[PDB]
Design an enzyme around this catalytic site. Structure first.
Site, PDB file in Angstrom:
ATOM      1  N   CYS A 111       0.815  -1.215   0.000  1.00  0.00           N
ATOM      2  CA  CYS A 111       0.000   0.000   0.000  1.00  0.00           C
ATOM      3  C   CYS A 111       0.852   1.270   0.000  1.00  0.00           C
ATOM      4  O   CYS A 111       0.579   2.208  -0.751  1.00  0.00           O
ATOM      5  CB  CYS A 111      -0.943   0.023   1.216  1.00  0.00           C
ATOM      6  SG  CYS A 111      -2.440  -1.019   1.096  1.00  0.00           S
ATOM      7  N   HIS A 112       1.882   1.298   0.840  1.00  0.00           N
ATOM      8  CA  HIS A 112       2.756   2.465   0.931  1.00  0.00           C
ATOM      9  C   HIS A 112       4.244   2.119   0.963  1.00  0.00           C
ATOM     10  O   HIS A 112       5.093   3.011   1.019  1.00  0.00           O
ATOM     11  CB  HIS A 112       2.380   3.295   2.164  1.00  0.00           C
ATOM     12  CG  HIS A 112       0.976   3.810   2.128  1.00  0.00           C
ATOM     13  ND1 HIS A 112      -0.022   3.334   2.958  1.00  0.00           N
ATOM     14  CD2 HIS A 112       0.390   4.721   1.316  1.00  0.00           C
ATOM     15  CE1 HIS A 112      -1.159   3.933   2.648  1.00  0.00           C
ATOM     16  NE2 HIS A 112      -0.937   4.777   1.659  1.00  0.00           N
TER      17      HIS A 112
END
Ligand SMILES: CCCCCCCC/C=C\CCCCCCCC(=O)OC[C@H](COP(=O)(O)OCCN)OC(=O)CCCCCCC/C=C\CCCCCCCC
Ligand SMILES: CCCCCCCC/C=C\CCCCCCCC(=O)OC[C@H](COP(=O)(O)OCCN)OC(=O)CCCCCCC/C=C\CCCCCCCC
Ligand SMILES: CCCCCCCC/C=C\CCCCCCCC(=O)OC[C@H](COP(=O)(O)OCCN)OC(=O)CCCCCCC/C=C\CCCCCCCC
Ligand code: HEM
Ligand code: HEM
Ligand code: HEM
Ligand code: HEM
Ligand SMILES: CO/N=C(/C(=O)OC)c1ccccc1COc1cc(C)c(I)cc1C
Ligand SMILES: CO/N=C(/C(=O)OC)c1ccccc1COc1cc(C)c(I)cc1C
Ligand SMILES: CCCCCCCCO[C@@H]1O[C@H](CO)[C@@H](O)[C@H](O)[C@H]1O
Ligand code: FES
Ligand SMILES: [Zn+2]
Ligand SMILES: [Zn+2]
Lengths: 147, 295, 80, 380, 61, 379
Positions: A111-112
Site C-alpha cells: 500500500c505504501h
C-alpha cells in the site's frame, strides 16, 4: 429483584451469543511447517502465525538498529520461540501486509511500501507503531487461542 | 391543652379536665364534695409553706396549734400511690372553620418530676423558646423557629413547654396561626425539634442556659412565687432545690448532652396531637409522624 | 395551594391513633370476613347474572356449532 | 420565598404538587390504581421497547430473523422480548379496567381528562397495531393487509390514502420500515399526552366512588396512595410475570412463528384479544365501508358518553338499575371478544350482529334512558 | 429481645437502617439463589446436563 | 376568567409563554437564537423521521438505503440535505446562543444555564450517532476513533467500550443501537428544552444592558414574535442557500465511500462543529489526558457562573472583558482550523497553545480582568 432486572437489561447491551462466537480463533501448533507462513481470519482482520526455522532467532533477533521508533523488546510480551503471532494489519491505514517476499525477508505492505521484518516490526517505511500484537495464553501445547 | 391531655392519656386519670364534666357539676352532692375534702385534704399530703418576714419557729408552732386531728391507724399515714397513666401516640382534631385562627399542640411522653433530664429538656425548650407577634426582636431573634415565624409569617404565637407530672409529663409545643400557614409552621417546628437531636451547638446551649438561669430566678420574684415553688418542690421533688443546686445542674449541660436527651424522648416516637379550629391544612398523622426523624 | 380553599366544615372531632399504637389488620374474623361476605352477597345478584347469562350463549353457541359439523344420517338413507 | 425545598423549587414543586402533597379523596378504591399502573406500564414498554429496538432490523428480509436472533442470541433478549409483548396486554388490561372504572363512576364528567383519555387510548391502539407488524410473521403481515385494506372503502379519497400508507401497492418493506418509525414515535406521543391527561385531572382532583364532594375529607397522596399504588402494582405485575414466565405464548397466536408470505394466507386471521371485540364488530357488518364505520364508532363512541349522562347522581353506586345495565354491557364485550375469535359461520354471525347491535344500543339508548327513568324513581 | 435490639442498632437511625438493607440484601441474594437453584434442580433430578454430564466428560474414545 | 386563554389550563400555556409573556423592550438579535434553536429542533425531528422511514440500520444496507432514499424517494434527496445541513444550522444557532449568554452574563440564570449546557451535551451526542448511520468511511472511522477513547479510562475502559459496541469493534450491533439512540435523543432534547424554558420564565429574559427591565417590558407578541420570524428568515436563507446550491460544501467526501474496517481514510476529521474539540483532544499526547481535555473543554461551561467577578452583568460597559471575549472567540476559530489540519509542525505547537489559551481565558483571565475591572470603577 431490582438489582437482577437491571443486571439483566445491562448485560443485554453487551456482546451477544453470536458475536461472542466469532470472538476467538484457535491455531494448532502441530500442523504448521518450518519457514512457510499461513494466514487466517480473526475479528475481521487477518491474523499471522508463522513457524520460523532457525534463521530467525539468529538472523532477525540480532538485528542491530540504533534509534528504534517503537518499544518492541523480545522479552516483554513474546513467549513462543520458533513461533510468532501478530495482527495481520498494517498499523498505518489498516492495510494488510504479505508473507511471500520482502526486503528484510519479513512481510511487505504494498500500500505504501512499509517493510516489516520477520519479527513484526516496521523498518523501511512511514507506519508509526509496529504491527499490533494480540493477547493469548498457554495450557495446550499443540494449541493456541487468541481472544 | 385539655384536648391534648384527653388523647395524650385517654382512658386514664390524666385525660380528665380539672373542671370536670358538665354532668358531674350538675349533680355533684354535699356528700361527694365532703368526701373529696374528707379523703383528700389530709396532713401528710399537705405542705404549709411560707416566705417573708417570718421565723420558722413562730410559724411551725401556730401549725402545731391548728393542724390537729391526730391519725389513729396507719392507713391515714400512708401516702396513696397513684395508678399510672398510659401515653398514647394519637391525635384529636376539633374543626370549626368559623374559628378565626387555629391552635396546634404537639407533644411526647415526659419523664416525670423526679428524672434529672427534665433539666436538660428545659435547656432544650430554651433554645426553641417562644414567640408572639409583639416580640420586638422580630427577624433578629435567636430562636430559629421564632425568626422563621417572622421571615415567613408562620404564626401568631408558639411556645415550648415541659409539663411534668409525678410519674409522667408532656413535652412539646403549641402554636396559633392562620388557616393557611399551619403547615409551613408545623413543618418548621417539627424541624427545629429534630435539629435538637442532631446538630445542636454549644452556642445554642450556652445561650439556653443563661436564659434558663434568668427564668428560674424569675419564678422566685416575690413571696407568693416563692411559697409556690416550695409548696411544689417539697410536695413533688421531696426536698427543696436551691438556685445554687439548680444552677450547677444546668452549668453541667452541654450540646452533646442535649442531643442525647432530646433524642431519647423525641426521635422516632409517636406523638400526641391536638388541633382546634380551621385546621384543614395540618392533616395526616402519618406525615406528622414521619416528621419525627431525619433532619 | 390546594389544601385549605376546599370547603367550610364545622364542629367535627376526629380521633385516630398512631399505626404503632394500634393493630395491623385488626379483627379479621369478628369484622373483616363478615363484611367481605356482606359485600360479596349484596352484589352477586347484579354482576353474576349477565356473566352467567353469557356462559350459556357461549355454550349453546359453541356446542351448536359442532353439532352442525356432524353429518345427518337422513341425507344418506337412499344412496344404495 | 419558602421554607422547605419542594415548594420553592420550580422542579420539585412538580414532583411534589402532583405525587406527594397532592389532595386525594380518602375513599378512592382499587379502581383508581389503574391510573399509575397505566403510567408505570408505559414507563416499562418504552424501556423494553428500546432495548429490543437496539437489536431489531426493520426489513422484510431480516425482521423475522432479527427478532429471532434477539431472542436466541441477545443476553436476556428473550426475557426482554416477552415482557414487551406481554407488557402490551398488561397495558390494555389496565386500560380497560381504567376506562370501565371511569364509566361506572362518571369520571367522564371530567370532560377534558376524559377526552384526553380517549385519545391516549386511540394512540395506544394504533401503537400496538404497528408494533405487531414488526416481527413480520404471517399474522404480522396479514393483520396489516386486512386492516389497512379497509381504508379503501372510503369513497374516492381513500383508494389513494391506502397506496400512500403502504408506500407501495401492498404491504411491503416500504411499509414495514415506516411502521417501525411510527412504533418508535407514538409511545412518546402517548407519554406526552399522558402529561396533559394528568393536568386536566389536577384541575379538579380525583372523583370518588360515592360521587360527592371529597373536600370534606381528603388525604395526602403520600403515603396513603403511593403505598396503595405500589401494592396495586405488585398485585398485577404478578400474573403479568406469571403468564409471561410460565406460559409465554398462551396469548399469542402461532401463525406468527411462520415468516410472513404474501403468497399464502393463514387459515384464520385474528388479532390479539384486545382487538377482538372490535374485530367482531367490524365483521358483523357485511360491507367494508359500514364495518369500517362500525369499528370506528365502536371506539369513537366513547367521546359521546359525557353527553349521555342523565342521572342526577354521578356514580352508579346508588343506582342498581344502571349497574346491571353496566354489567350487561361488560359481559356484552366479553361476548364480542369471543365472537371475534370465531369464524364467519352460523351461529356466530347472528350472535355477532346481535352483540354489536346491543353494544351500541346500550351506550346510546338504554344507559341514558334508564338514567332518566332512574331519576324519576328518586322522585327528582 | 431481638425486636428491641433490632429497632435500636438497626432500624433506628435512617443510616444504619439503609446500611442494613444493603448488607442484608447481599446475604439474601447470596443465599436465596442457592435455595432456589437447589429447589429447582431437585424438581428436575437427572434431567439437566449438570447431571448427565459425567457420561461424556472424560469417558469416551 | 373573562377571556378564554387565562382560564383554559392549555391556552394558559400557549399564552403565558408566547403571547402575554413579559419581555424586555431592549433585547437584541442575540435573543432570537432561542426560538431559532427551538424551530431548528422542530425541523430536524421532522426531517429526521421522514428519513428514518426509508432508512435501514444494517452494516449491509445502511449506505445503500441512504443512497436509495436520495435516488428513489420523492424529494428524498431534498429531505436528506435539509437534515444534514439542519444539523449545522442547529450548531451555529447554538453557538451564537451560547456566546450571547456569555457576553451578557445570562449564565447568572444558573438553572436556565445548566439545563442549557445539558441540552448542548445531548445535541452533541445526538449528532455523533446520527453521523454513523450513513455508514460511510468517515461514519465508521469517526465512530471508532472516538468510542476508542473510552478505553483510556483505567479498568472500566476496555469493559465500558466493548459494552458500548456490543462487540469488539464498531459493527452492526453498534450501528443499530446508535440508530435507536439517534431516534431517541432528539426527543430527550425537546423534553429538557421545556425545562430550560421553564427556569427561564422564572426570571424573564436578561437584557443587553444588564439592569432591571421591570421599568419597561413589552408583550412577546407582536414585538418579539415578529422579530423572531424575521430572525428566522435572515438565517433560513443561507441555510437553504448552501443546502440548495452547495450541498456538500460542508461534508467531507470520504463518506461517499462505503465504510471498510480494513482501510483507513487519509485523514479522519469530523464536521466543523466538533473541530474545535477534536483539536483540543489531539493537542494532548496521551489518550487519557486528551479525553479529559475534550471533556472539560465542554464541561467547563458549568463553571462559568462561579467565575463571574464583575459588579456588572453584561460586558456592554466593560471594554476590557469584551476584547478578552473576542480574543476567546477567535481563539475558537483557530482551534477549529487547527482541527481540520494534520499532526505536523507548526500545527501541533499552535494547537497546544490555542487549547492552552482557551482554558486559561475562561479560568484565569476572565475572572481576573473582571476583578481588576471592578476596581477601575472604584468599587
Ligand atoms: C373492551 C374489551 C373488553 C374485554 C374484557 C375485559 C376483561 C373482563 C374481566 C371481567 C371483569 C370482572 C370484574 C369483577 C368486579 C366485581 C365487583 O367488584 O362488582 C361490584 C362493584 C360495586 O362498586 P360500588 O357500588 O362502588 O361499591 C360500594 C362500596 N362497597 O363494582 C366495581 O368495583 C366497579 C366496576 C368497575 C369494573 C369495570 C371493569 C370491566 C372492564 C371493561 C371495559 C369497559 C368499558 C368500555 C370500553 C370501550 C372500548
Ligand atoms: C448485590 C445486591 C445488593 C445491592 C442492592 C442495591 C439497592 C440499594 C438500595 C438501598 C436501600 C434503600 C434504603 C431506603 C431507606 C428509606 C426508609 O426510611 O425506608 C423506605 C420508606 C418506608 O418508610 P418507613 O417504614 O416509615 O421507615 C423509616 C425509618 N426509620 O419508603 C417506602 O415505602 C419504600 C420501600 C418499598 C419499596 C416498594 C417498591 C416495589 C417495586 C417492585 C417492583 C420490582 C422491581 C423491578 C424494577 C424495574 C426497574 C426498571
Ligand atoms: C465553538 C465553535 C466555533 C465556530 C465559529 C462560529 C461562527 C463564527 C462567526 C463569526 C461571528 C462574528 C459575529 C459579528 C458580531 C459583531 C458585533 O455585533 O460586535 C459588537 C457587539 C457589542 O455589543 P454591546 O456592547 O452590548 O453593544 C451596545 C449597544 N449598541 O457584540 C455583540 O453583539 C455580543 C457578542 C455575541 C456574539 C457571539 C457569537 C460568537 C460565537 C462563538 C461561540 C463562543 C462561545 C464558547 C463555545 C464553547 C464550546
Ligand atoms: C394513556 C394512558 C393513560 C394513563 C397512563 C392514565 C392515567 C391516569 C392517571 C394517573 C389517573 C389518576 C388516577 C386514576 O387512575 O384514577 C387517571 C385518571 C383518569 N383517567 Fe386516565 N389514563 C390513561 C388513559 C385514560 C383513558 C383511555 C381514559 C378513558 C377514555 C382515561 C380516563 C381517565 C379519567 C376519566 C380519570 C379520572 C379518574 C377519576 O375518576 O378520579 N384515562 N388516568
Ligand atoms: C406504546 C408502548 C408500546 C406498545 C403498546 C408496544 C407494543 C408492541 C407490540 C404490540 C409488539 C409486537 C410484539 C410481538 O412480537 O408480540 C411490539 C414489538 C416491538 N416494539 Fe413495541 N411497543 C411499545 C413501545 C415500543 C417502543 C417505545 C419501542 C422502541 C422506541 C418499541 C419497539 C419495538 C420493537 C423493536 C418491536 C419488534 C420486535 C418484537 O416484536 O419484539 N416498542 N411492540
Ligand atoms: C437545546 C437547545 C436550546 C434551545 C432550543 C434553547 C432555547 C432558548 C430559548 C427559547 C431562550 C429564550 C430566548 C433567548 O434565546 O434569549 C433561551 C434562553 C437561554 N438559554 Fe437556551 N436554549 C437551548 C440551549 C441552550 C444552551 C446550550 C445554553 C448554554 C449552556 C443556553 C442558555 C440559555 C440562557 C443563559 C438563556 C437566557 C437568555 C437570556 O439571557 O435572556 N440555552 N434558550
Ligand atoms: C437532535 C436533532 C437531530 C440531529 C442533531 C440530527 C443529526 C443527524 C446527523 C448528524 C446525521 C448524519 C447526516 C449525514 O449523513 O450527513 C443524521 C442522519 C439521520 N438522522 Fe438525524 N438528527 C436529528 C434528529 C433525527 C431524528 C429525530 C430522527 C428520527 C427519529 C433522525 C433520523 C436520522 C436518519 C434516518 C439519519 C440517517 C440517514 C441520513 O444520513 O440521512 N434524525 N441526523
Ligand atoms: C398489524 O396487525 N396487527 C394486528 C394485531 O392484533 O396487532 C396487535 C392484527 C392481527 C390480525 C388481524 C387484525 C389485526 C388488527 O386488527 C385491529 C387493529 C386495530 C388497531 C383495531 I382499533 C381493531 C382491529 C380489529
Ligand atoms: C461518528 O463520528 N461522527 C463524527 C462527526 O463529526 O459527526 C457529526 C466524527 C467524524 C470523524 C471524526 C470524529 C468524529 C466525532 O468527533 C467528535 C464527536 C463528539 C460528539 C465530540 I464532544 C468531539 C469530537 C471530536
Ligand atoms: O415556565 C413556563 O410555565 C408555563 C406554565 O406552567 C409552561 O406552559 C411553559 O411551557 C413553561 O416554559
Ligand atoms: S497501510 Fe501499510 S504501509 Fe500504509
Ligand atoms: Zn392460529
Ligand atoms: Zn477528505
Amino acid at each position: 429483584a431490582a438489582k437482577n432486572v437491571v443486571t439483566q437489561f445491562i448485560s443485554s447491551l453487551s456482546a451477544s451469543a453470536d458475536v461472542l462466537a466469532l470472538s476467538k480463533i484457535e491455531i494448532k501448533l502441530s500442523d504448521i511447517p518450518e519457514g512457510k507462513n499461513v494466514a487466517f481470519k480473526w475479528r475481521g482482520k487477518p491474523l499471522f502465525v508463522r513457524h520460523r526455522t532457525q534463521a530467525e532467532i539468529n538472523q532477525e533477533a540480532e538485528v542491530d538498529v540504533s534509534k528504534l521508533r517503537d518499544p518492541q523488546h523480545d522479552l516483554d510480551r513474546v513467549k513462543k520461540p520458533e513461533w510468532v503471532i501478530l495482527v495481520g494489519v498494517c498499523t498505518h491505514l489498516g492495510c494488510v501486509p504479505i508473507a511471500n517476499s520482502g526486503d528484510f525477508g519479513g512481510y511487505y505492505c504494498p500500500c505504501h511500501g512499509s517493510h516489516y521484518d520477520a519479527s513484526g516490526r516496521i523498518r523501511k517505511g512511514p507506519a508509526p507503531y509496529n504491527l499490533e500484537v494480540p493477547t493469548y495464553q498457554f495450557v495446550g501445547d499443540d494449541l493456541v487461542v487468541v481472544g | 391543652f385539655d384536648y391534648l391531655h384527653a388523647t395524650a392519656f385517654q382512658g386514664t386519670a390524666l385525660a380528665r379536665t380539672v373542671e370536670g364534666t358538665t354532668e358531674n357539676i350538675k349533680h355533684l352532692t354535699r356528700a361527694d364534695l365532703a368526701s373529696y375534702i374528707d379523703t383528700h385534704f389530709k396532713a401528710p399530703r399537705m405542705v404549709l409553706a411560707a416566705a417573708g418576714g417570718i421565723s420558722h419557729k413562730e410559724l411551725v408552732d401556730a401549725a402545731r396549734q391548728h393542724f390537729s386531728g391526730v391519725s389513729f391507724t396507719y392507713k391515714e399515714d400512708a401516702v396513696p400511690i397513684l395508678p399510672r397513666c398510659r401515653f398514647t401516640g394519637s391525635e384529636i382534631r376539633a374543626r370549626d372553620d368559623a374559628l378565626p385562627v387555629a391552635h396546634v399542640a404537639l407533644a411526647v411522653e415526659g419523664p416525670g418530676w423526679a428524672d434529672p433530664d427534665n433539666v436538660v429538656l428545659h435547656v432544650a425548650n430554651a433554645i426553641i423558646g417562644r414567640y408572639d407577634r409583639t416580640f420586638g426582636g422580630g427577624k433578629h431573634l435567636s430562636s430559629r423557629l421564632a425568626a422563621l415565624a417572622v421571615e415567613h409569617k408562620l404564626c401568631h404565637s408558639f411556645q415550648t413547654f415541659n409539663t411534668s407530672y409525678s410519674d409522667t409529663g408532656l413535652f412539646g409545643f403549641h402554636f396559633v396561626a392562620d388557616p393557611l400557614s399551619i403547615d409551613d409552621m408545623m413543618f418548621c417546628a417539627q424541624g427545629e425539634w429534630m435539629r435538637l437531636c442532631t446538630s445542636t451547638t454549644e452556642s445554642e446551649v450556652k445561650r439556653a442556659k443563661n436564659h434558663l438561669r434568668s427564668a428560674m430566678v424569675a419564678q422566685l420574684d416575690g413571696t407568693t412565687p416563692v411559697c409556690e415553688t416550695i409548696g411544689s418542690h417539697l410536695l413533688n421533688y421531696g426536698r427543696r432545690i436551691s438556685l445554687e443546686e439548680w444552677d450547677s445542674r444546668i452549668s453541667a449541660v452541654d450540646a452533646r448532652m442535649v442531643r442525647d436527651v432530646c433524642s431519647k424522648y423525641i426521635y422516632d416516637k409517636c406523638p400526641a396531637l391536638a388541633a382546634v379550629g380551621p385546621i384543614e391544612q395540618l392533616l395526616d398523622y402519618n406525615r406528622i409522624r414521619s416528621g419525627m426523624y431525619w433532619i | 395551594i390546594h389544601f385549605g380553599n376546599l370547603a367550610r366544615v364545622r364542629h367535627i372531632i376526629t380521633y385516630s391513633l398512631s399505626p404503632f399504637e394500634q393493630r395491623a389488620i385488626p379483627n379479621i374474623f369478628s369484622d373483616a370476613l363478615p363484611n367481605v361476605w356482606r359485600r360479596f352477597s349484596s352484589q352477586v345478584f347484579k354482576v353474576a347474572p349477565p356473566f352467567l347469562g353469557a356462559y350459556l350463549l357461549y355454550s349453546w353457541g359453541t356446542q351448536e356449532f359442532e353439532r352442525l359439523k356432524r353429518k345427518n344420517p337422513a341425507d344418506y338413507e337412499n344412496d344404495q | 420565598m419558602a421554607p422547605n425545598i419542594r415548594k420553592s423549587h420550580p422542579l420539585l414543586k412538580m414532583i411534589n404538587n402532583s405525587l406527594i402533597d397532592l389532595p386525594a379523596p380518602s375513599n378512592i378504591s382499587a379502581w383508581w390504581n389503574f391510573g399509575s399502573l397505566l403510567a408505570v406500564c408505559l414507563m416499562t414498554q418504552i424501556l423494553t421497547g428500546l432495548l429490543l429496538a437496539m437489536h431489531y432490523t426493520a426489513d422484510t428480509s431480516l425482521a423475522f430473523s432479527s427478532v429471532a436472533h434477539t431472542c436466541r442470541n441477545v443476553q436476556y433478549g428473550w426475557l426482554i422480548r416477552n415482557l414487551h409483548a406481554n407488557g402490551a396486554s398488561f397495558f390494555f388490561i389496565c386500560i380497560f379496567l381504567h376506562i370501565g372504572r371511569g364509566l361506572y363512576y362518571g369520571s367522564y364528567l371530567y370532560k377534558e381528562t376524559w377526552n384526553t383519555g380517549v385519545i391516549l387510548l386511540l394512540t395506544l391502539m394504533a401503537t400496538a397495531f404497528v408494533g405487531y407488524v414488526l416481527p413480520w410473521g404471517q399474522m404480522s403481515f396479514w393483520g396489516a393487509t386486512v386492516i389497512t385494506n379497509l381504508f379503501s372503502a372510503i369513497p374516492y379519497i381513500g383508494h389513494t390514502l391506502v397506496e400512500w400508507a403502504w408506500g407501495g401497492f401492498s404491504v411491503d418493506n416500504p411499509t414495514l420500515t415506516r411502521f417501525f418509525a411510527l412504533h418508535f414515535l407514538l409511545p412518546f406521543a402517548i407519554a406526552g399526552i399522558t402529561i396533559i391527561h394528568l393536568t386536566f385531572l389536577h384541575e379538579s382532583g380525583s372523583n370518588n366512588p360515592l360521587g360527592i364532594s371529597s373536600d370534606s375529607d381528603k388525604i395526602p397522596f403520600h403515603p396513603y396512595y403511593s403505598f396503595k399504588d405500589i401494592l396495586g402494582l405488585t398485585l398485577m405485575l404478578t400474573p403479568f410475570l406469571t403468564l409471561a414466565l410460565f406460559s409465554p405464548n398462551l396469548l399469542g397466536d402461532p401463525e406468527n412463528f411462520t415468516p410472513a408470505n404474501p403468497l399464502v394466507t393463514p387459515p384464520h386471521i385474528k388479532p390479539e384479544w384486545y382487538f377482538l371485540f372490535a374485530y367482531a364488530i367490524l365483521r358483523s357488518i357485511p360491507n367494508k365501508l359500514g364495518g369500517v364505520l362500525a369499528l370506528a364508532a365502536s371506539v369513537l363512541i366513547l367521546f359521546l358518553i359525557p353527553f349521555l349522562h342523565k342521572s342526577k347522581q354521578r356514580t352508579m353506586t346508588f343506582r342498581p338499575l344502571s349497574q346491571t345495565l353496566f354489567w350487561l354491557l361488560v359481559a356484552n364485550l366479553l361476548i364480542l371478544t369471543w365472537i371475534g375469535s370465531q369464524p364467519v359461520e352460523h351461529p356466530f354471525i347472528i350472535i355477532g350482529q346481535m352483540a354489536s347491535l346491543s353494544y351500541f344500543t346500550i351506550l346510546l339508548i338504554l344507559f341514558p334512558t334508564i338514567g332518566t327513568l332512574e331519576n324519576k324513581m328518586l322522585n327528582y | 429481645a431481638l425486636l428491641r435490639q433490632a429497632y435500636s442498632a438497626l432500624f433506628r437511625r435512617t443510616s444504619t437502617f439503609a446500611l442494613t438493607v444493603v448488607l442484608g440484601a447481599v446475604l439474601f441474594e447470596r443465599a436465596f439463589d442457592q435455595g432456589a437453584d437447589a429447589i429447582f434442580e431437585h424438581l428436575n433430578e437427572g434431567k439437566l446436563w449438570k447431571h448427565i454430564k459425567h457420561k461424556y466428560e472424560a469417558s469416551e474414545e
